[PDB]
Design a protein around this nucleic acid. Structure first.
Ligand SMILES: Nc1nc2c(ncn2[C@@H]2O[C@H](COP(=O)(O)OP(=O)(O)CP(=O)(O)O)[C@@H](O)[C@H]2O)c(=O)[nH]1
Lengths: 468, 79
RNA sequence: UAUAUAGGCGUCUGGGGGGAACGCGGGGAAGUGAAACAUCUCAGUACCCGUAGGAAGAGAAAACAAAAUGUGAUUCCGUG
RNA sequence: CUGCUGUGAAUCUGCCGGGACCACCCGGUAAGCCUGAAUACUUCCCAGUGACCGAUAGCGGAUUAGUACCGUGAGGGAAU
RNA sequence: UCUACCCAUGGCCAGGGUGAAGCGCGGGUAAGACCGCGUGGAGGCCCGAACCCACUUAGGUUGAAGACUGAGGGGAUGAGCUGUGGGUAGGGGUGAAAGGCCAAUCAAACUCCGUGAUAGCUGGUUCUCCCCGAAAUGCAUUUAGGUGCAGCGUCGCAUGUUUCUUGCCGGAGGUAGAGCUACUGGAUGGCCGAUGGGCCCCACAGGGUUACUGACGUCAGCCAAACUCCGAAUGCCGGU
RNA sequence: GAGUGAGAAUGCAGGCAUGAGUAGCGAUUAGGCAAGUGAGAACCUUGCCCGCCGAAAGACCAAGGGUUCCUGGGCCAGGC
RNA sequence: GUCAGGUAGAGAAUACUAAGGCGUACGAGUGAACUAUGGUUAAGGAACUCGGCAAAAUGCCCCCGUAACUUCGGGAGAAG
RNA sequence: AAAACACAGGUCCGUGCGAAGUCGCAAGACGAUGUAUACGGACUGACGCCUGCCCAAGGUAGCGAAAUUCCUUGUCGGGUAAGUUCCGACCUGCACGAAUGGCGUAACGACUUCUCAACUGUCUCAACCAUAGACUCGGCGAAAUUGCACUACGAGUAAAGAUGCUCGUUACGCGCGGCAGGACGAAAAGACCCCGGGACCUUCACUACAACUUGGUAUUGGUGC
RNA sequence: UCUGAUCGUAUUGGGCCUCUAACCUCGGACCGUAUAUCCGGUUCAGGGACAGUGCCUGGUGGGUAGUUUAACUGGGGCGGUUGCCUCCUAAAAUGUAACGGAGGCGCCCAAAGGUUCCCUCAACCUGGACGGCAAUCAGGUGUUGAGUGUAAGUGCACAAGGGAGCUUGACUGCGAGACGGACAUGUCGAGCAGGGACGAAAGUCGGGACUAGUGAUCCGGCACCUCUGAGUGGAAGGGGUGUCGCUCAACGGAUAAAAGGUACCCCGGGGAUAACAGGCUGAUCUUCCCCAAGAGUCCAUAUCGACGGGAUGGUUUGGCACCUCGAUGUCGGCUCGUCGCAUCCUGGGGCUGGAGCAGGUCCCAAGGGUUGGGCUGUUCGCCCAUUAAAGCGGCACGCG
């Protein structure tokens, strides 16, 4: 079974140009604000990242690590360094290239480390192969994605659906690393909490006994069954009223909540994190002339949407498929906003595949104008396709986002001319308050005007609609 | 789920063996102690392990001097 | 085969098997006790083989003893 | 004091024992025999005995008893 | 004498099918191989009674019976079935091998003997009244459901209040409580304040500084089995 | 001087209850009548009729049994 | 182990019968539920059930026609 | 009662012949009245298939395929209303496993698991009929079990599941035929689990012995170096 | 014979080659013998002092036998302990369990021991080249906060802490009287003599400031002794004194010497102890509630409702081990049920983000009803086609 064992001796794994024990390990990551990463005690885990170069190049090569460093920071632990490889072939064992297990163990011992991350879901063995070698707590992209939601959880809906997603992510890897984590347990506090992550509930662990895990997944599934009824009951008035609705669809950190605060005077939370707004929240707004429409946010969508966590985004998906006009917020940080938008848009495709109604009208926007395009200039503003953006990284003025949004929203409101006579002392008040008052060509006595009206007011004034 | 603890030591029966106003023969132990909880006064001697023993027949007495409790053997008068 | 012997022939005298115990000689367990177990004990018992006698076996110092002028085959009892 | 295997002496200034052994003393005189009495036991017989049983007892067997009967056999084995 | 295998000598297998070799004839050919036809009747061949076995199901299950019956089943010229007579005997046999069978039992058969095996285990242990009257603890244990010693019972002997209760007197304690600016810890909000940074002069030296920080310290309120500057009540040890 | 005191040992020997006058009275064929016998008859004897086996449930031989064969007599045990 | 009638049959299967031998040893009633052994079942046809378990169904003789594959023997009584 | 044993076939090892091997303390016996084409042991278990340049010394030399199924990797459909066994094209780079183990295989099987046709009381869903019991009458006549007795129910209490105790309810005495919910029903001093003892088995547990083998010496001698 | 090469002759062992008379041959031929594949005898032919057998001896040896294979343990296993020392638990004398909370030990020192004498640190402040926060030095403040070889505690500034001089008491022969104590062990000891050390003397010295640093008996080793000495003198051996050898650590130590399987099992017992069942608890679970931040278009309460808090039921996973092991037979299905309501349908209401059609949630309501199939052992669940619905639960997870 053991053949010539000279592979890292003379042979090269995937060294087309740069691979096979190269471990570029560039881009040392890390970032410092005022120093005092912790200020009293171990508030940083001194984590390290990993990346596997695949289809693509510098356009995306470092993009994975760029996203992961920010995400781990959001979790609240200093990222020491990142490490990738060209990796022509993803080895199912550890898909890391030449199995440089000793090399990575040594380069993580040279650093404080004591925590490692990965990119993509890892099979139980696909991660044990590195757990053994590294001898340190290892938690991959989906584990951290779930831990972020757990930490940020606020309401029963979240504390149940994130819990279910975590249990079901454990399901395929209940053997091995889960027992490895429980062995020493959290030890006061671990690097991965439970249902609420940020202390509080979920302090004990995620998976401890297969029986209890299955029991709790059952109970949680019933709970989401209950919550679906509750949610559809709550979402009655809008569907019963046929009131146009719009949705803020942004990848993450694209200032969706901040934009909502703007344009509606809303006071929703706007925190620095890739997953800040927990549940889709909405508010009534007014178009240019009226139309007391509805505007809702969306929850963060990150590249390679972890399918292990869909119960959380199910509510968001419903709220986007039950809408008319979609406005696509982007974040002006990365270098490939085109990739950001295409990636986030890859999800609406399956959204419509499942709940096919229609392709809703689409509009584009990108926040962070003040800090973005520092070397981009107005190329993305003139040459690039449909897009409007004035929000700043803190807030700005809105000029035509509220005009084109109305011109692109459903125009179901009939605009056929109607004749309103004097009749009662203020009979025209009904039309003035309902159907807007656009073009109030007030004349005299039995004032003659031209304004739009909805289906019931149109049918009520039909007989009185005498041509001009 | 073993326990690291579980060990202990035997019963070193320390403590005062003759209390105030007790008639003693020469050589008897008065307190078995560890260290110098008590000191010797008159007719009281210290042994190897900080034991206190009588040096004359008499009656035990506990007093203080210079800030340290001391044990003494007051000589009983023959009636 | 030569002496000769094996062998053959005849004739005379004996053995053969049984018996309850006891005798002498020879093989000889294990259960058990040891709070387990192997030395050890059980025990030279059980059992077996040989072999008799009215009884057998041992018996006439190449002995004990200790300076006593000692006792004087063997056997079996009682002490030691 | 003895059984097997090797080796292997002197005839009285000889040889053995006297609790390793050595000297002096002391006791015997190996490698040849036979020998009663005191002593162990009751298959059997005769005459008695019992602070022994008295028919579920006393022998398994007071009556067909090693019978009937059970087992291929060794063997077990009643009741009156 | 059952059963496993083996040996000697006998016996049994209704009926009906297919048709291998061998042999003869004819084609194919140098040539046989090969191809049709005939006799022939091989086969651990086929179907199926006797016979042998035991796959399914029902019945029985204090049965008709300590392994059977009914109805279907498998083999049925063969490694076949069976009669009579023999051989292999227990740590041994025999085994197309199941720890199967060896006389209704087999991970070592039966009977008698050693033998009244041993069992820290379970059961049993037979008439009466009077007096006294427990323990379920400590230590040790190839020990924990046993046992030895001590403790606690009873009886005899010796002394006699030494026993015990109450008062008073003489003692050591660090528990309850309480206290922390008295020790070791954590911690609550203020006050001043080095580090300072950043700012105004501008040096960098030298002056103010500065939503702020807490070095030390200060004020008010805290708490602790393994904290104690203190510290009871009971208990205990003597005397009277 | 004791084989001296039983209510228990799923104790042992004998006798007798409860279940209970209860289950069962043993194959898959089947008996009926007339007459007799006799105290007594479904079961015995005779005559008829009906039914069953008929590669036996008929007739022999061997092993095994040991008198069970036949005649006369008898009917308290046995014959479910 | 030996004998092996007649008819239908290939048959020593099966059915009924000859010779021969039996009716073999508790009966008489009674349309109870229920159990066992047989019989039949409308219409559907495995829905039963762990599973077509059991039961049903085909079944004989003579003529036609017989597949995939094959160790060239078969398959094969193919099946129809 | 089978997939297990056997089997014809194959491959190793021992045996040169009162062999090897086995029974026996030995003699002796079988093997064998046989002789390496034979005998004994050991695995496997008809039959077919399994792959090249280096490979008085050429060099990494392991093929680097296959008829490969752990291969629920949805990796799709056929199987039907919904279909398990399966059937076929994909992900199936050390995957795997096989130089002596794997693939195929006609025929066969009271083997295991499925689909179709026919057939049906298996079922929807049961009804009826006959016989043998049951039942009644006559005769004979047991058995296991058994501390007792003119042996209710509810809620409680109790060694924690009450015929037997407490408080209430209900019930005329005695039988017959049936059902099977209790009497922790009968049966067997629980086979499970633990403790103690035992037995048999395994082994590089301990200690012995059989047997084998190594040397000294007796049998055991002479002459030459 | 003392200091001593080689000698002449006679006594011998081994290695090697042979021979024949020991011995061997199931190689032949004859005789007992009429039959004899037995056996013995004669002789021939081959081996041959080998082989085989006796006594002795070293290896291999489950081929066979006798046995061992600990205990605690919130059942057993697995894991972890097993002796000694210190603290808390430990309830102010001593003592006191738990698989309770923390740790150390299996030594070290010839000076870190004895004695005589002298000194006082840590920390802080002020000043000084390297030299700094911290080295050495100066002054001051500094009563214990440094240190005390080693764990923790009790004590130590009177110093037991820090230096120095000299010394070996890290003695021999004892020991009144006590502590602790099941016993065996274990600790203290004033003082007497001999000979020493230190000190002017008085005085202290029988190891370390104290408490751990260890192992019974048996058996045997090594030095000395006025012991004993198997007739006697000796010697052998024994005896006394002093000491030596055990991770006998399972540390009161069965043997000098020892692991496992059993579903092929068996016997004696146990509800002292488990699996099912009941019983208590309710951690877990289910049913809800309290408060309301927030969501819900505005709007806490139509519908939800976080962070927190309180309970009900005894169905889940568990805890305990109270009855039952001289027997309480396990799951799913079938037949037959009966009950609770926490209501799936049918029935009556409130509110509604109730236009109507319908929906949501809550209240009252248990009369009756609540399908057939394919897969799924499946605990269970997925699918198919219907219905008004295909309810949830208890009854030994009802009923063998
Ligand atoms: N680009 C942008 N960023 C803003 C704006 N206002 C605030 N931010 C910053 O962006 C940070 C992230 O908030 P925001 O991007 O609104 O979160 P989100 O993208 O709406 C929702 P999620 O974070 O889950 O993806 C905040 O810390 C805030 O300081 C804005 O108008 N535009």
């Amino acid at each position: 079974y053991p053949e010539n064992s000279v592979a890292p001796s003379t042979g090269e794994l995937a060294l087309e140009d740069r691979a096979s024990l190269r471990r570029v390990a560039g881009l040392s990551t890390e970032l410092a604000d005022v120093s005092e990463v912790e200020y009293r005690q171990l508030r940083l885990e001194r984590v390290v990242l990993v990346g596997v170069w695949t289809e693509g190049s510098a356009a995306d090569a470092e993009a994975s690590l760029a996203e992961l460093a920010a995400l781990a920071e959001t979790a609240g632990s200093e990222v020491l360094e990142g490490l990738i490889q060209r990796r022509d072939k993803p080895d199912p064992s550890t898909y890391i290239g030449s199995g440089k297990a000793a090399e990575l163990r040594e380069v993580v011992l040279a650093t404080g480390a004591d925590t490692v991350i990965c990119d993509g879901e890892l099979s139980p063995a696909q991660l044990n192969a590195l757990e053994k070698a590294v001898k340190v707590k290892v938690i991959d992209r989906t584990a951290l994605i779930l831990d972020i939601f757990a930490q940020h959880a606020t309401s029963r809906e979240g504390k149940a659906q994130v819990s279910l997603a975590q249990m079901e992510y454990m399901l395929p890897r209940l053997r091995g690393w889960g027992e490895s984590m429980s062995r020493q347990a959290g030890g006061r506090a671990g690097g991965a909490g439970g249902g609420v992550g940020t202390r509080g509930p979920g302090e004990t662990k995620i998976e401890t006994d297969r029986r209890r895990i299955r029991e709790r997944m059952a109970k949680l599934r019933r709970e989401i069954r209950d919550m679906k009824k509750i949610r559809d009951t709550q979402r009655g008035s809008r569907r019963r009223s046929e009131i146009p609705s719009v949705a803020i669809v942004g990848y993450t950190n694209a200032g969706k909540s901040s934009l909502l605060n703007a344009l509606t005077g809303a006071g929703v939370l706007v925190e620095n994190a890739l997953f800040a707004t927990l549940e889709p929240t909405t508010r009534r707004g007014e178009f240019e002339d009226g139309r007391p429409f509805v505007l809702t946010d969306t929850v963060g969508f990150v590249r390679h949407l972890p399918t292990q966590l869909v119960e959380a985004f199910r509510s968001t998906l419903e709220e986007v498929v039950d809408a008319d006009l979609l406005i696509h917020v982007v974040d002006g940080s990365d270098v490939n906003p085109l990739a950001q938008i295409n990636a986030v848009r890859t999800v609406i495709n399956e959204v419509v595949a499942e709940y096919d109604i229609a392709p809703p009208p689409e509009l584009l926007v990108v926040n962070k104008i003040d800090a973005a395009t520092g070397v981009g200039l107005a190329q993305l503003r003139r040459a690039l396709p449909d897009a409007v953006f004035v929000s700043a990284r803190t807030g700005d003025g809105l000029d035509k986002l509220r005009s084109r949004m109305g011109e692109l929203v459903e125009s179901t409101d009939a605009t056929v001319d109607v004749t309103i006579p004097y009749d009662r002392g203020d009979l025209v008040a009904r039309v003035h308050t309902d159907g807007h008052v656009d073009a109030t060509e007030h004349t005299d006595a039995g004032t003659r005007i031209k304004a739009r009206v909805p289906a019931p007011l149109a049918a009520t004034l039909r007989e009185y609609a005498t041509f001009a | 789920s073993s326990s690291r603890n579980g060990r202990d030591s035997a019963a070193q029966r320390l403590g005062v063996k003759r209390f105030g106003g007790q008639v003693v023969k020469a050589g008897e132990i008065l307190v078995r102690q560890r260290g110098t909880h008590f000191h010797p006064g008159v007719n009281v001697g210290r042994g190897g392990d900080d034991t206190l023993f009588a040096l004359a027949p008499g009656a035990v007495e506990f007093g203080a001097k210079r800030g340290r409790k001391t044990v003494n053997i007051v000589p009983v008068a023959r009636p």
